[PDB]
Amino acid sequence: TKYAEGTQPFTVLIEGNIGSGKTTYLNHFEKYKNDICLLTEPVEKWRNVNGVNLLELMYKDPKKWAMPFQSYVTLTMLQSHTAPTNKKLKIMERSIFSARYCFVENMRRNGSLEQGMYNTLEEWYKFIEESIHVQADLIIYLRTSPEVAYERIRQRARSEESCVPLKYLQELHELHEDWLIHQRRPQSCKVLVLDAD
Amino acid sequence: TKYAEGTQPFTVLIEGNIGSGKTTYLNHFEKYKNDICLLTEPVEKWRNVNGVNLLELMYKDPKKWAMPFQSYVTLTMLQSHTAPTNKKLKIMERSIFSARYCFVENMRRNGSLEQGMYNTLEEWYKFIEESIHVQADLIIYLRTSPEVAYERIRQRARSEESCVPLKYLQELHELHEDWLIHQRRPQSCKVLVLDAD
Numbered sequence: 001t002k003y004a005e006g007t008q009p010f011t012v013l014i015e016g017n018i019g020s021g022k023t024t025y026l027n028h029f030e031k032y033k034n035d036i037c038l039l040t041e042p043v044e045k046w047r048n049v050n051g052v053n054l055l056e057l058m059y060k061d062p063k064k065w066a067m068p069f070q071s072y073v074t075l076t077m078l079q080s081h082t083a084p085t086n087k088k089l090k091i092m093e094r095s096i097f098s099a100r101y102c103f104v105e106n107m108r109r110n111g112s113l114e115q116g117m118y119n120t121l122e123e124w125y126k127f128i129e130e131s132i133h134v135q136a137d138l139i140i141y142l143r144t145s146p147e148v149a150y151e152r153i154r155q156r157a158r159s160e161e162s163c164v165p166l167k168y169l170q171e172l173h174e175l176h177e178d179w180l181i182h183q184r185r186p187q188s189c190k191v192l193v194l195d196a197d
Numbered sequence: 198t199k200y201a202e203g204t205q206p207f208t209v210l211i212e213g214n215i216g217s218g219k220t221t222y223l224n225h226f227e228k229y230k231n232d233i234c235l236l237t238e239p240v241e242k243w244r245n246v247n248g249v250n251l252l253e254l255m256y257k258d259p260k261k262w263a264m265p266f267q268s269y270v271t272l273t274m275l276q277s278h279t280a281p282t283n284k285k286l287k288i289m290e291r292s293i294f295s296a297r298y299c300f301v302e303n304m305r306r307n308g309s310l311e312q313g314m315y316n317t318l319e320e321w322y323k324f325i326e327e328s329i330h331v332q333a334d335l336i337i338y339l340r341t342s343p344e345v346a347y348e349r350i351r352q353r354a355r356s357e358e359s360c361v362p363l364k365y366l367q368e369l370h371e372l373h374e375d376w377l378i379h380q381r382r383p384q385s386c387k388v389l390v391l392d393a394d
């Protein structure tokens with residue numbers, strides 16, 4: 001019997017590249033706060049971990065900070081996945097699955113995460129699967145081109161993202177495609193594709 | 198309810214400094230193994246995580262590797278704490294508590310863990326406490342002098358531990374005292390103190 005098992009409503013995960021408009025899309029649901037559990041913009045947690053900006057530290061020095069940063073992403077997603085609600089609907093920006101299948105995998109490929117750091121994160125994912133219930137009934141995938149993602153990133157202008165290269169977003173885009181369109185990853189529930197260009 | 202709640206027998210934790218004799222002490226129960234769940238020598242997991250020696254890497258480069266290493270230590274302890282058994286007694290070498298209250302404390306103090314890494318591990322520890330059940334009925338404390346621990350470490354001669362100085366063991370000793378003697382930490386059930394010198 002897993003933690004939070006049987007405590008969760010029908011759950012929708014809002015996914016897509018950085019700057020695909022996940023927060024914008026979820027903002028339309030806000031007037032319905034009373035009926036829907038909305039867990040949005042988890043990045044604010046990562047930018048301020050009791051005063052520490054892990055997002056900043058990660059981009060400045062990935063070979064040292066990518067590991068703690070992803071471990072903390074994993075935690076905050078878990079907190080949101082397992083958060084109690086009395087409501088019939090929960091909608092989340094991001095999920096433990098995108099952290100794992102896109103970000104962690106990409107950082108393994110680019111060498112930000114050495115094998116040992118990758119292995120530790122992966123062993124955690126496996127234990128989490130056996131011990132903690134992650135409700136997932138629908139994923140809405142905001143599909144975008146890397147060029148479009150890139151312009152939104154620049155317009156929003158997060159200081160931490162000011163050095164994010166187009167190639168990185170191309171890498172992440174394909175990984176979202178692998179996961180949500182080509183079913184290269186084990187995880188499976190309904191996916192609704194939307195054009196966010 | 199938390200993961201593993203109501204699944205665990207009376208649980209004994211064996212604690213003490215590096216080289217204090219936890220495994221040696223647990224060896225005395227080997228003939229009772231069919232009636233006691235015995236989880237010994239977790240360092241063997243940390244020396245080989247699919248071929249990666251996390252212990253070795255932590256000691257060669259703590260500013261980089263102490264974080265992922267402590268994260269994996271935490272995981273493996275948790276795997277042992279929550280492991281199913283039909284036996285009426287469980288005895289474990291180490292616990293999540295000594296990893297948190299002794300090793301992580303010391304690595305933060307000596308600057309092996311930056312605030313960001315420290316904060317990440319602590320946020321995990323907090324969530325684990327909410328989500329995962331850790332059975333703890335007795336701690337047996339194999340109390341040693343740092344000097345004797347040092348001798349035993351040198352005799353055993355783990356290559357990973359070749360550069361461990363007496364000062365490090367003195368530091369850990371006072372953190373074991375702080376927790377198990379002075380009780381300046383949260384719970385810790387009853388403690389039975391043994392002279393392992």
Ligand SMILES: Cc1cn([C@H]2C[C@H](O)[C@@H](COP(=O)(O)OP(=O)(O)OP(=O)(O)O)O2)c(=O)[nH]c1=O
Pocket residue numbers: 016017018019020021022023024041043055070073094098099100103104161
């Ligand atoms: C989920 C996740 C985000 N990140 C980073 C990428 C971004 O710099 C930042 C937030 O990314 P996103 O999770 O994509 O959030 P966003 O607000 O940028 O998305 P949108 O514009 O569609 O609303 O965190 C990781 O490094 N690893 C991760 O696992």
Ligand SMILES: Cc1cn([C@H]2C[C@H](O)[C@@H](COP(=O)(O)OP(=O)(O)OP(=O)(O)O)O2)c(=O)[nH]c1=O
Pocket residue numbers: 213214215216217218219220221238240252267270291295296297300301358
């Ligand atoms: C539990 C723990 C151990 N360690 C390290 C210290 C040691 O080098 C190694 C194993 O230490 P110990 O957990 O003390 O195990 P041991 O086998 O050396 O003890 P004993 O001789 O009493 O049987 O792991 C950490 O770095 N962090 C931790 O949280």
Ligand SMILES: [Mg+2]
Pocket residue numbers: 022023024041093
């Ligand atoms: Mg957003």
Ligand SMILES: [Mg+2]
Pocket residue numbers: 218219220221238290
């Ligand atoms: Mg031992």
